């Protein structure tokens, strides 16, 4: 019997795939988000503060 693949199998996409967002995602904050401060925060003073008394 024919042992090979079917070269005429439906090659197109599926136009009836589920077109919705997943109602069961992971609805939580990330506990492993970077908890540290930014070392590259601008360490210079602001030259645009008010120069008047």
């Amino acid at each position, epitope marked *: 019997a024919n042992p090979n693949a079917n070269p005429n199998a439906n090659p197109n996409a599926n136009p009836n795939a589920n077109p919705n967002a997943n109602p069961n995602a992971n609805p939580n904050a990330n506990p492993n988000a970077n908890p540290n401060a930014n070392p590259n925060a601008n360490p210079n*003073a602001n030259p645009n503060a008010n120069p008047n008394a």
Partner: antibody
Amino acid sequence: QVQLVESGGGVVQPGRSLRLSCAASRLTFRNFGMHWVRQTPGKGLEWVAVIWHDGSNKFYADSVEGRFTISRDNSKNTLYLQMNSLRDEDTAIYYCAKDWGGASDRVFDYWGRGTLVIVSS
Amino acid sequence: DIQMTQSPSTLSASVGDRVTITCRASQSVSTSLAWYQQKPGKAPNLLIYQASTLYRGVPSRFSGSGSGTEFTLTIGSLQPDDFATYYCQHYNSYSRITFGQGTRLEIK
């Protein structure tokens, strides 16, 4: 034209303390942050520390956390770094620096010459 | 910390040609990259910030490009005074500053 003079180096034994100074000249020290950069004998540049414009916040690299202490004195125009509990890997030419001053750019413009510290016995 | 790798480590060229030096990032740095050139006996001087912007006083033959992890510093025409060690430095937010190994460009 802004030249950074750094000093206080020499040869120290492992585990002993040492003080480095970065006295400035004609640069507005107070309104600019400062950086220490370590250039290893193997031709590599490692960032060391940065101090804010008024000393409010202070950051270090992981390899120098807790063993290095930097301080900023606006009064006599100098940046200070106290160097403690050393071993062999800290033997390198130590560069002073000055962040350019951009809103989000941590880039050095006016580098210092460098003061070389030896850890040996 | 980000290991900031620049390739090739050493590339030889003669005056007048086009030479490009790139630097690889372990993970995305967006466009917070900087380039420094270090002639022997002198501290490195900045050329490019924001990975594409030429610093003041930088000759126009100096040029930076790239984003993410792939960046390129391109030389418009190599000059006799452009022979030194070149470094790539990133200042990504929430990350510590690291430098590259240093690429050496050598005569002929």
